[PDB]
Amino acid sequence: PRVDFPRSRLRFKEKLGEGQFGEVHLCEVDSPQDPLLVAVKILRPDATKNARNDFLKEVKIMSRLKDPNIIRLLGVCVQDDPLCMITDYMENGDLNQFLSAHQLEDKAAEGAPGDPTISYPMLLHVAAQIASGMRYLATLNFVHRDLATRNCLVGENFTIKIADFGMSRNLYAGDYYRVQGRAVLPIRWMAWECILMGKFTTASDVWAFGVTLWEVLMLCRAQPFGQLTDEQVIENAGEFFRDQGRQVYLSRPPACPQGLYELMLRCWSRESEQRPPFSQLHRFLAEDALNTV
Numbered sequence: 001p002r003v004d005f006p007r008s009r010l011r012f013k014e015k016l017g018e019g020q021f022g023e024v025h026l027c028e029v030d031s032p033q034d035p036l037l038v039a040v041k042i043l044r045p046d047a048t049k050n051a052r053n054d055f056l057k058e059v060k061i062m063s064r065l066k067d068p069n070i071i072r073l074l075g076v077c078v079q080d081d082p083l084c085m086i087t088d089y090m091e092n093g094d095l096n097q098f099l100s101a102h103q104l105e106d107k108a109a110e111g112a113p114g115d116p117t118i119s120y121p122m123l124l125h126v127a128a129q130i131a132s133g134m135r136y137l138a139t140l141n142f143v144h145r146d147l148a149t150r151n152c153l154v155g156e157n158f159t160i161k162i163a164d165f166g167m168s169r170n171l172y173a174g175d176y177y178r179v180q181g182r183a184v185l186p187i188r189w190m191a192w193e194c195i196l197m198g199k200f201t202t203a204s205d206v207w208a209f210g211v212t213l214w215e216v217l218m219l220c221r222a223q224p225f226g227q228l229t230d231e232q233v234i235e236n237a238g239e240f241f242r243d244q245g246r247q248v249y250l251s252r253p254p255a256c257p258q259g260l261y262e263l264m265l266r267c268w269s270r271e272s273e274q275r276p277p278f279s280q281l282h283r284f285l286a287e288d289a290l291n292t293v
């Protein structure tokens, strides 16, 4: 049984987010002997028995995860109240808002440090870290179910970590299909068998990664299928099922060469078994994509 982090050492500084059962604060750790900034998730002030149960379950889930490109618990406080989970502070926030504030470079390495520009090789590097994170989760047979740039965090030096904020942020409400007034399904990231059969697998996470890769190469300027309605996106899932060549795909991003786009298309194969494994996606993004055509 791991020992609790010493709660008294936290200095609460700013609120970073609010989710379904917890809320996240930026904290300073008063002199770190085993300015240090960490993110700390605690129960919402309106927490009921249901919220505490959900929080204790998440501690269990998070205890499974140990990879540089996945959120990791730096510590916990669970033996007594208040309950806390502690992770690294990622100073550049979510990847969607981050990339949207950048523009693609003209020539490689032409700008000054700090400028809001980004290279194609850096887009590859961001995607490759996401693929490495997902490759890790696949080995634990952990199915994420909501991969997208909004659920990735950005630290120093463009390091990426996969998280899962839930469907709670007003900022991203448009990314979720609603049933009975609440967000339920990120349909624009969902494989046709997720929509039609309710089947979530590693291969559907591969489909979502394809959309996330599309997002990254679009520098998060547009929503997937952004000029189609939710009903049309759901209808498109039906055309994948019927397989008579009426299905439509996300278009090739301007910044994306044809070779990379064809691998993206493979992520959206009708048959789950034909989609690439995350091992192959990572190898391509990390090495083959640097090849000169």
Ligand SMILES: COc1ccc2c(n1)C1(CCN(C(=O)c3ccc4[nH]ncc4c3)CC1)C(=O)N2CC(=O)N1CCC[C@H]1C(F)(F)F
Residues within 6 Å of the ligand: 016, 017, 018, 019, 024, 039, 040, 041, 058, 061, 062, 065, 070, 071, 085, 086, 087, 088, 089, 090, 091, 093, 094, 144, 153, 162, 163, 164, 165, 166
């Ligand atoms: C502090 O302790 C925790 C513990 C868990 C989580 C979290 N914190 C956040 C971390 C981002 N988050 C911010 O509100 C947030 C916002 C800005 C920030 N900057 N630096 C850190 C940070 C965190 C929601 C809670 C989050 O998503 N979760 C879920 C999570 O990671 N899950 C759920 C299943 C397994 C795993 C995943 F990805 F693999 F699916």
Ligand SMILES: [Cl-]
Residues within 6 Å of the ligand: 224, 225, 226, 227, 228
């Ligand atoms: Cl569109």
